[PDB]
Amino acid sequence: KPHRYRPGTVALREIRRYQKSTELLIRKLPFQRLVREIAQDFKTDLRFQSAAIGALQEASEAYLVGLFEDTNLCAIHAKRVTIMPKDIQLARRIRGERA
Amino acid sequence: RGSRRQIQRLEQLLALYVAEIRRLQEKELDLSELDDPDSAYLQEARLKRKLIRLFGRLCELKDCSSLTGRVIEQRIPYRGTRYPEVNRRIERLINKPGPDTFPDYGDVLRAVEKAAARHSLGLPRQQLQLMAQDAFRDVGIRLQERRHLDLIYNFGCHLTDDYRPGVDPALSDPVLARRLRENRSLAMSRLDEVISKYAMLQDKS
Amino acid sequence: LDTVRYDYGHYLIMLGPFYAESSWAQAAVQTALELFSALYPAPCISGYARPPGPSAVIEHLGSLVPKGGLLLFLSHLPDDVKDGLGTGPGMQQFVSSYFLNPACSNVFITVRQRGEKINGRTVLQALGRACDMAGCQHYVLGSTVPLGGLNFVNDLASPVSTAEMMDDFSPFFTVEFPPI
Amino acid sequence: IQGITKPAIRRLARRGGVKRISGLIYEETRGVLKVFLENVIRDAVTYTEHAKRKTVTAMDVVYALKRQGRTLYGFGG
């Protein structure tokens, strides 16, 4: 239990959200461009808040890890077997919905 | 103490980075701004990283070791067998550092047969595997909702922050409710047919 | 009272003890508050709520919160209730027995602590001193948070810091609020 | 046409407690990702233009996320 730091000028929950955001896996240009692809897709042309791209990324990876969590949570094996859409569809069959 | 005078300039610099991070978080982007590698979004991410490592500099500057307030950090203790030193080896799944510490069934079985072997338990592969399955699903779930929890804790920014659940506009204007029931229909339809798409596709094997 | 906006991450405090008897304690809480506005004159209270009254504690706590919910600690409960702990959600039931039904002479406040030590005092500390001098008991129960309605964390083992109450903590024994 | 990293996906997978994966699972996650975003934005925009606005808001996206079933469950009560 070594010492810990709380700064005076910044609320922690802000610093924890910033550190949370720097943690995201996918690179942010690829993402930004995938939202472009879906917007130019939808024929809707609206400016997006950058705050809203933020929300979309945080939530997307939430969902994806959520699906791998779901798929590994039903794996009973004799040794490691590599994971296939068989397995994801079975995991989803058992639990479902989101993450 | 003339140095203690300098450390607060670093702290308010932190305050400044957060000022500009919110100024960028508000800036709105059309589509061509969304192809931009220099866009207000990516600027906001460059700023967030420069902040967090200023913070880290500063943490290692006060001896205080770098970490901040997350449920990820606390080791999650587990005694779910009736056998406490199986839970010795098992309880440090987590002792492995940071995120990405999360097992599959194989790992739990290796740790339960580790604590079976070197502690010399000697119980059949039967109830050994009951212990391994019960435990794996139990801590799988506990860990999952611990992560989810950390998500609803720190999510979005000061903009998403102010959200009441019952000012949802769909409530007073049922035309909107109509449209949204429609979109959710579409959404679930698609999810399930894409998952089954790659199922019945990988059947090509 | 001066007000400031309600955002997540403030502190929840309760001012009071644990006509007639309720008339004495009253004179103290409102006294301490005044003293506070004097001792620390910068507008940090977001969400004072008494109303309507007299009403069951959790209902008092209901009108305190516009968004999200609260997370409070078992060590920072009043020693009268804290003592009845020394067994899972079995104890959720008891802490409901003490903090749900009983009707309060107490005042619940949410104060925001933002930098800016005044004189010697912090927010929590100027409320500490103004409270003691005013002859008034005060418990800092926990902090205001995005998740859940009412969330208790098991604090009994190690206490939380006066200051370290804003961290994440993952509760057991979660309690939904009331209706209107 | 360039995608998103085969390692980044092997890394989301690894985060889910998954070691290695069938090849085609790579592109499955791509597909799944894109479906998700679609019907979040679809819902977000539905708000945005109902309220008659030229910009999609981080609030619009919260209102959409919480509508996605379990996804944001627990937030803001």
Residue numbers in the entry:
A (entry chain A): 37 to 135
B (entry chain C): 182 to 386
C (entry chain D): 383 to 400, 413 to 480, 488 to 581
D (entry chain B): 26 to 102
Text taken from the publication that reported this structure:
DAXX (death-domain associated protein-6) is a histone H3.3 chaperone that functions with the co-chaperone ATRX (ATP-dependent chromatin remodeller α-thalassaemia X-linked mental retardation protein) to assemble repressive heterochromatin at GC-rich repetitive elements, such as telomeres, pericentromeric regions and endogenous retrotransposons. We now report the structural basis of how BNRF1 interacts with DAXX in a stable quaternary complex with histones H3.3 and H4.
The structure of the quaternary complex shows that the BNRF1 DID folds into a globular α/β domain and is positioned on top of the DAXX HBD—H3.3-H4 complex with X-ray structural statistics listed in Table 1 and a portion of the electron density map shown in Supplementary Fig. 1a. BNRF1 DID has seven anti-parallel β-strands (β1 to β7) forming a β-sheet core fold, which is further surrounded on both sides by five α-helices (α1–α5). A DALI search involving the fold of the BNRF1 DID alone based on the quaternary complex revealed that the overall fold is highly similar to the structure of the B-lobe of the first PurM-like domain of the Salmonella typhimurium FGARAT (StFGARAT or StPurL) protein23, with an r.m.s.d. of 2.1 Å. The DAXX HBD—H3.3-H4 portion of the structure of the quaternary BNRF1 DID—DAXX HBD—H3.3-H4 complex, is similar to our previous structure of the ternary DAXX HBD—H3.3-H4 complex, with small local differences in the binding interface for BNRF1 DID and with a small r.m.s.d. of 0.7 Å. The BNRF1 DID uses four loops (L1, L5, L11 and L12) to capture the chaperone DAXX HBD—H3.3-H4 complex through contacts to each component of this complex.
